[PDB]
């Protein structure tokens, strides 16, 4: 039958590459979806950009089901959880290099 979703492997892929080019990894998420764990106030137009470069995050986790890590908003340490379903894109802050994720049935 149909295989498991690809997004997570490609995500981790681009992640490692943007860092082998010094660039800084930024994640775009859809907050209008279930399972999303972030300070909603920091979002805008049903979205939110998160910095996931090594130095700006703690205990980053790029699992196939979700993205987990700690970070600070305004300085308050806070946990974050993003369903791979709502991970819209990954890109570099410096020169926008990266990729937008293609739709897959696994994520409806």
């Amino acid at each position: 039958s149909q295989l498991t979703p690809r997004r997570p492997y490609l995500l981790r892929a681009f992640y490692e590459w943007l860092l082998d080019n010094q660039l800084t990894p930024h994640l775009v998420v859809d907050v209008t979806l279930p399972g999303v764990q972030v300070p909603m106030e920091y979002a805008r137009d049903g979205q939110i950009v998160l910095n996931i470069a090594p130095r700006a995050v703690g205990n980053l986790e790029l699992a196939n089901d979700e993205v987990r890590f700690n970070a600070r908003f305004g300085g308050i340490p806070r946990q974050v959880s993003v369903p791979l379903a709502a991970v819209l894109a990954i890109y570099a802050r410096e020169n926008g290099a990266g990729t937008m994720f293609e739709p897959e049935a696994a994520y409806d």
Partner: peptide, 8 residues
């Protein structure tokens, strides 16, 4: 981004 540059 929404979060700060350093989790230091």
């Amino acid at each position: 981004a929404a979060n700060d540059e350093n989790y230091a």
